Every structure is written in structure tokens, then in C-alpha cells.
Design a protein around this nucleic acid. Structure first.
Lengths: 141, 191, 137, 75, 127, 53
RNA sequence: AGCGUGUGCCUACCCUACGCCGGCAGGCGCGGGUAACCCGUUGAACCCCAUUCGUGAUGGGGAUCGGGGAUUGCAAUUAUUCCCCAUGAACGAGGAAUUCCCAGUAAGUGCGGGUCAUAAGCUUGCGUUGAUUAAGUCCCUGCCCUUUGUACACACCGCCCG
């Protein structure tokens, strides 16, 4: 495994947990309260979820040259039920993603990229690749 | 895959349309085994062509009904793949054989048409073509499974298996079997 | 596993116990779903269960949070009554007390004789909507 | 009709019913457990995942949408 | 309206703030609190311009005897926001054809003049 | 001089017309043409808008 | 993913990536772009999926109303609109009737353009996912083909007896 080698769900699942063990990520004190998207029906069932998003994002950046919060809000953004009106896109929160981006920096997984947008760092690039291997290794099944 | 072209994982060979005449708008694969109940499929242009279409897929298509469910083939393919698995658990066999059997057993042989009849319009007993027999059967079973599934906890894959199995050996438990007997009973009077 | 309660009361409403807590709570006037969902998360409960389950302990704990939400990392924007006016509150009205304040507010602008008030009094509409074709029955 | 009311918490005796029955059925899903007992559906679920323990029941597909379980692994 | 009890006795706090306190700031410090729509209107209104009106209010507040109500002050500014400076005055509030006359109680605060002069007429189905 | 005589004209239907005919209704504002539809129908040949399909 | 779109404009003004603050709504600082250069490998949405729910108008549904946050505008009160909470309706499949339709077609599903300061439940295309079903005929309906009848000819929505 390149991270590209591992399936997205298991990769994210494994990394997100690894982050949880590490114990040092950092977390707008909120996260209990927050929905994550105006579109959103209820907050996240796994109140633990902050880690999962972080993993998801780290993987998301590693794939691509550089990305920023607006893109993430939309990615997270689902369809919002206008009620009487037909449903439409609504890019998902900007505080969570930003905080995610800021926090990741602390670990050095990602760093400000040139010309705007955060890019993965070689430190992160190394870190993701390492867990990617661990996941591949676990088993067949 | 290279040895024999099985179904999701089921063999086309050795399934025999146990019913002369029907033979052949039920399309298994007197060579045609594939892999998946999904295809680009252009059946519509010609009147006949539909017969070519694998019966499995034909059944899958009928599955995606009701305005909301239109165009959800992926959903149907998923349901069909599950149903075959449930059917198999229930009787071994080829669930595809089970499917074929239900289809053979359900097509109304005889039917009725609303002949003008002057006034008190009476209805004329007429025999029914094999294309119709196939077409009608697949509806009946699908409408049967869909109707049952709707207010119950049970899933379409399950209700489909139940409709298919009961029909394969015509239990008459099935909605479809009861419907077919009703249509036929009507055909006989009138005459 | 275990059992008990069916049928528990919190502050002046009867709450079906069979039901899931988050949903179970939402009988209480002023507890909508987004509410009750966040209150419970605050209140430490295994989210995974039925209102009929849980302890008398956890219950007071839900109520305590429910009527002092601000004091528990619940933001004000989550709240029913921001900016009171009469006291310049923030607040989150609850239970029988929502019907109450609803009455107040309607009275307020009926005293003042404002057109909205008048509308409520005749039992028409107060947002700008056309009244020619609908709300007829 | 069809009004369904469900026992939503374990009653001992209903715990016994579960392990001393379900080996009876060839098909078990959420619905089966619900109809044949009077299980919540929510507490059906938890009984399925538990049953798959080291199984009374055996997985043949748990499609997101659906578990589909068979009888245990007898003769 | 000056001394122990005399007149006073209707109270009303706006936003935790008291009318004693209310009546003593600057409209500035009032809109600061909470109201948000009214405050933006006055800021943007601004430059502001119902200037003369506000002087017409104080004027007739003066000339009013010493006990009661007095004469009133007319206007077409439906979009005006009631602020403590106004309270106790009497406003002729136009609706299209009529000027409805309204004393502004402290409760109204933050509301728009238009909300107290109904334009339309209830209506009729039977009658 | 007559301070009297105008209220905002910056935006809305009232801020624009037909360069051809004054009409403040059914106005084509795309590509900066600013012709009312009725006129644009009559002048679309001389502007260079031709029927193809 | 695709049709399309933009400022530097007949007279006031653009599309906006990216940092920060805010739960949101949004606020704020930048910097490019007369564009096949930039927004935008339009990283859309259905969908697919690992969970929860469990057949309860319930978590289906989102009406009505209350309070509150913000955006457009000089001015929004008669809600321009948006959000946040709360209040959480009818509706559990639709009688008499009746529209439209043959292959990327019906249907689901998002997007962009027009309106536009602000405002989409609209219209007007576009791609995406994509069936069932006649494969014909003149019965009903509508219109034109002969032959035929006609006191009709403002033509049957027409002109005959007490």
C-alpha cells in the first residue's frame, strides 16, 4: 500500500482510531453540540466523530494538490430539504473543517500550500503511508 | 469466470425450461450466461427483441416500480442478487431455476378479453400467447412481492424469495398464483 | 436486559418510557428533536437505548441541563428565546411554560394593538401571505 | 389492522426463548425475530449481533440493508 | 413623572436594562442592545433624518399641559423603529388613507411604527 | 434646483428600459443588449442573431 | 459530470478560489480573471456504502405559529430572502373525471441560464441514474380521403310540429 492501495472505509476507519490513541489532536471544546452542516438533521451519532473527519480530510488532501474549507463544506454538504421547495446542495460547516485543518497542522500532517489551499506534508505523507500498510497487513477477508 | 460463465455465482447450464412453448422467451443462456442483471440493453426498438433479454434482468427491471423506484436498477440488481441467495438457502437448487419455474407456472394459459357483446358486454375466452404469459408472470410475481413487502418488516429480497419459491412449486400461497388462477377461471366461463 | 419503568413524568409532562430517550423527551413542549438530542449528549447517557430504561439519577441530570442549557456548552443559538427583551435574555422556554410565553407574546402586541396582534385576534395570518385563496375550511 | 406492539427490554424468560428457539428457524432476520417473539426491532437487532456471538446463527449476507441469517450449522 | 411613585408605576425593563436606565442613554447605547433589525435600520437610516420628527415629538411633549396626553405628531415613516427616546409620545401613523393615533408604551420597543397602524381591513365572507 | 423630483433609480425594473423603445417590461439584459423582447424579435437579424434550430 | 456564466458595462458595478472569526446564517482580509488562462481535472446530486431506526403520521411529513440571529436596499412594516430554536397540521394512496407518452423514452435526480438590487415552489435547457409497455389500429376522440344524404351555408354550436 500507497494510501491509494487501501479501501477508503477501512483506511479512514483505521487512521481515525490511530489518531484517537495518539491522544493529541485538539478540539473546539464544542463537538458535543455541533451539527456539522446546516443541512444536517441531527449531529453525529458518534460524538467521537471528530477523529473520523480528521482522518477523512487527511486522506482527502494527500490525494490532491491542495484543498480548502469551502471545498470540504460542500463535500460534507449534502442535500437540504427545502420543505415545500425542491432540495439543493448546502456545503457543510466551515468551523469544523477549519479547525480540522488547523489541528492537523499542529501534528504537521498538512501545511499551508502555495497559492492557497492546504497540502499534505511529507511528514503526513509518511504517516498515512505507514498506517495504510498496517491496514493492508491486517487481513485478507 | 474463465471456467464457466456463472451468475453472480450461479451456473446457467443445466437449467431447463420445464414447459414446452414457454421455452424461449424465457432467456437463460442456450448460451447467454452472464455475470450481472444489468446491461446497456436495447430491447425496445423491435417488438420481439425483449425475448432475447435474460429473464433474470427482465425480472430485475420489473422490480424497480413505482414512481419513486423508477430507474433504480442498482437497487434492483442488489435486491435480485440477495433474493437468489435467499432462495438457494431455502431449497438448494439453482435459484435461477427456481425463478424460471415460478415464471413458467404463473403465466395465465387462458384469459378473457372484453368482447363488445351488445349491451350486456360479455367476455370471450381466448388463449394467451407465450410472450404475454412471460410478461404477465413477471409482473404478477413482482407486484406480488412489492405489495406484500410494503407494510411489513420484511424486505423485498425476502418477499421476492417467498413469492418465487411458493410459485416455483405452485403453493398457491402466492399472490401471483392466486391471481393467475383467477384470470384463468374467468377465461373458462365466458366460453 | 433487566426491565423496568414504562411511563415516567418530567416537569409536568408524561413521557412514554418504551420510546427512545431523545425521541421520548420530545413530547415535552419546547423540546424538539435537535434539543433533546443535544441535551442527552450533554447529560452523559449511553445513547444506544429506551427512556423507560436509565436511572432516576440520569433523569434529573437531563432536566438540570435542559433548564440551564447555557451552563453546559449548549450555545445560545441553539435556544428558543434569545434576546428576551423583558430581561435581555437569552432563555430556553420549556414544558407548560412555552404555552405561557406564547400567550404573553400574543397579548403584548394585542395590548399595543399592532396589526399582527389584531390578526391573531380575528384568527387570520401575520406573516405577509395572501389571504384570498387559502386558509379557507 | 396491523397494529404491532413490541417488548423493548429483555425479560429473562425472553432471553431463554431466544437461544432455545432461533436454532429452530432456517431464516432469521429482524422481521422474523419481531413476529415470532414480540421483540422491538431495535432489540431484534441487538439480538442478531449477539446471536452471531460464536453463532447460534450464521451470516450469508449482512448487506447494509440486510443481514440474512441461516440455521446454525447442524446435520 | 417625577418623585416618589407619583405617576410612575408601569415599570418595564427592556433587555435586562431598566426604563430609568433606558430613558438615560443615547439611542446609540440602546440599539446596541438587542432588537437587531431595528438597530440596523437606524444605522443604515443614519445620516439619519427623522430628525425634524424627533424635534416635533419633544416640542409637543413640552407644550402638553402637565397631566396627560396632548396633541400628537403626524408621520408617514412606517419603517421607523421605536426607541426609548420616543416613549410616552403620540404618533399619527399613516396607513395609506388614515393616520391612526397611537401612544407608544415602553413595551413596543424595537418594534416598527407600521406594526401599530393596520393597513388592511379584516374583510368578509358572509355579511 | 427642485430638490423635489427624484427618488432612487439605481436598480430594479425602474432603473432600465429598451434602448429601442422605453418599455420597462420583458427586457433582454443578457450579453448587454438591453432590448425588450418584442423589439429584439424585430431587430435580431440586424444585430446578428439568426435562426438555425 | 455536462449545457452554460463572468468584471473593467448607456452611467452603477462582477465572477470569486484561498487565511481568519462565528454553531449557523454569515462576517472579515486577500489575490487572479475580457476567460480554452480564472472561479472549475465544474471532485454535483441521485446513487453506492458501514451504521441507526423497526414498521408507531414515528425518525414518514414539514404546515402553521412564537422568539431570536443575519443578508439586499435610503426605506422590508404586509414575512424579499436565509438561518437557529421552538410549536410538529393535514396527509397512512385519492371518487366522478382526466393529461401525456415508444427509446436515453416515461420516471427519479441535481446543475446552469432568463427574471434579478434582493428574492424560485416558475419557466427554460443541460448532464446523471434509467425502466415497464403497443409495435399496432380506426373503437372512442380529432382532422382530412372517397361515395352518399341534407329544408344546412353566420354552415349542427346549423335549420321542424302543435
Amino acid at each position: 500500500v500507497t494510501v491509494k492501495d487501501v479501501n477508503q472505509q477501512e483506511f479512514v476507519r483505521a487512521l481515525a482510531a490511530f489518531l484517537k490513541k495518539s491522544g493529541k489532536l485538539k478540539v473546539p471544546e464544542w463537538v458535543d453540540t455541533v451539527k456539522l452542516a446546516k443541512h444536517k438533521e441531527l449531529a453525529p451519532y458518534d460524538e467521537n466523530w471528530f477523529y473520523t473527519r480528521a482522518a477523512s480530510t487527511a486522506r482527502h488532501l494527500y490525494l490532491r494538490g491542495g484543498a480548502g474549507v469551502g471545498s470540504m463544506t460542500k463535500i460534507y454538504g449534502g442535500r437540504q430539504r427545502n420543505g415545500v421547495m425542491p432540495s439543493h446542495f448546502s456545503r457543510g460547516s466551515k468551523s469544523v473543517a477549519r479547525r480540522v485543518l488547523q489541528a492537523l497542522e499542529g501534528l504537521k500532517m498538512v501545511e499551508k500550500d502555495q497559492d492557497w489551499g492546504r497540502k499534505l506534508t511529507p511528514q503526513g505523507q509518511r504517516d498515512l503511508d505507514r498506517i495504510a500498510g498496517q491496514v493492508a497487513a491486517a487481513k485478507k477477508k | 469466470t474463465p471456467d464457466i460463465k456463472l451468475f453472480g455465482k450461479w451456473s446457467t447450464d443445466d437449467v431447463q425450461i420445464n414447459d414446452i412453448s414457454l421455452q424461449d422467451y424465457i432467456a437463460v443462456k442456450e448460451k447467454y450466461a452472464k455475470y450481472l442483471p444489468h446491461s446497456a440493453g436495447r430491447y425496445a426498438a423491435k417488438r420481439f427483441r425483449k425475448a432475447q433479454c435474460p429473464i433474470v434482468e427482465r425480472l430485475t427491471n420489473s422490480m424497480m416500480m413505482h414512481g419513486r423506484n423508477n430507474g433504480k436498477k442498482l437497487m434492483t440488481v442488489r435486491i435480485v442478487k440477495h433474493a437468489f441467495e435467499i432462495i438457494h438457502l431455502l431449497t438448494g437448487e439453482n435459484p435461477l431455476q427456481v425463478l424460471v419455474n415460478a415464471i413458467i407456472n404463473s403465466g395465465p394459459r387462458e384469459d378473457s378479453t372484453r368482447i363488445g357483446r351488445a349491451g350486456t358486454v360479455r367476455r370471450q375466452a381466448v388463449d394467451v400467447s407465450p410472450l404475454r404469459r412471460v410478461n404477465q408472470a413477471i409482473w404478477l410475481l413482482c407486484t406480488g412481492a412489492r405489495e406484500a413487502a410494503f407494510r411489513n418488516i420484511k424486505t423485498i429480497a425476502e418477499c421476492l424469495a417467498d413469492e418465487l419459491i411458493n410459485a416455483a412449486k405452485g403453493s398457491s400461497n402466492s399472490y401471483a398464483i392466486k391471481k393467475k388462477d383467477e384470470l384463468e377461471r374467468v377465461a373458462k366461463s365466458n366460453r | 436486559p433487566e426491565k423496568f419503568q414504562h411511563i415516567l413524568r418530567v416537569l409536568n409532562t408524561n413521557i412514554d418510557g418504551r420510546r427512545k430517550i431523545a425521541f421520548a423527551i420530545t413530547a415535552i413542549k419546547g423540546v424538539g428533536r435537535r434539543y433533546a438530542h443535544v441535551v442527552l449528549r450533554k447529560a452523559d447517557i449511553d445513547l444506544t437505548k429506551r427512556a423507560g430504561e436509565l436511572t432516576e439519577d440520569e433523569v434529573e441530570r437531563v432536566i438540570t441541563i435542559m433548564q440551564n442549557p447555557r451552563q453546559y456548552k449548549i450555545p445560545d443559538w441553539f435556544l428558543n428565546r434569545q434576546k428576551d427583551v423583558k430581561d435581555g435574555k437569552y432563555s430556553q422556554v420549556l414544558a407548560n411554560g412555552l404555552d405561557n410565553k406564547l400567550r404573553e407574546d400574543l397579548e403584548r402586541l394585542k395590548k399595543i394593538r399592532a396589526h399582527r396582534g389584531l390578526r391573531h385576534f380575528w384568527g387570520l395570518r401575520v406573516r405577509g401571505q395572501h389571504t384570498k385563496t387559502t386558509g379557507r375550511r | 389492522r396491523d397494529k404491532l406492539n413490541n417488548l423493548v427490554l429483555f425479560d429473562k424468560a425472553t432471553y431463554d426463548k431466544l437461544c432455545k428457539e432461533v436454532p429452530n428457524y432456517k431464516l432469521i432476520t429482524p422481521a422474523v425475530v419481531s413476529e415470532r417473539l414480540k421483540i422491538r426491532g431495535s432489540l431484534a437487532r441487538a439480538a442478531l449481533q449477539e446471536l452471531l456471538s460464536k453463532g447460534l446463527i450464521k451470516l450469508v449476507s449482512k448487506h447494509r440493508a440486510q443481514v440474512i441469517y441461516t440455521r446454525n450449522t447442524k446435520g | 413623572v417625577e418623585q416618589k411613585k407619583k405617576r410612575t408605576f408601569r415599570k418595564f425593563t427592556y433587555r435586562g436594562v431598566d426604563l430609568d436606565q433606558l430613558l438615560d442613554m443615547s439611542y446609540e447605547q440602546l440599539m446596541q442592545l438587542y432588537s437587531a433589525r431595528q438597530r440596523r435600520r437606524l444605522s443604515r437610516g443614519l445620516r439619519r433624518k427623522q430628525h425634524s420628527l424627533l424635534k416635533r415629538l419633544r416640542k409637543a411633549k413640552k407644550e402638553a399641559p402637565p397631566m396627560e396626553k396632548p396633541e400628537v405628531v403626524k408621520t408617514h415613516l412606517r419603517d421607523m423603529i421605536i426607541l426609548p427616546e420616543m416613549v410616552g409620545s403620540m404618533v399619527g401613523v399613516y396607513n395609506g388613507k388614515t393616520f391612526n393615533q397611537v401612544e407608544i408604551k415602553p413595551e413596543m420597543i424595537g418594534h416598527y411604527l407600521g406594526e401599530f397602524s393596520i393597513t388592511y381591513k379584516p374583510v368578509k365572507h358572509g355579511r | 434646483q427642485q430638490l423635489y423630483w427624484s427618488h432612487p433609480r439605481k436598480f430594479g425594473q425602474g432603473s432600465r428600459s429598451c434602448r429601442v423603445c422605453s418599455n420597462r417590461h420583458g427586457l433582454i439584459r443578457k450579453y448587454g443588449l438591453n432590448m425588450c423582447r418584442q423589439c429584439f424579435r424585430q431587430y435580431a437579424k440586424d444585430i446578428g442573431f439568426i435562426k438555425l434550430d
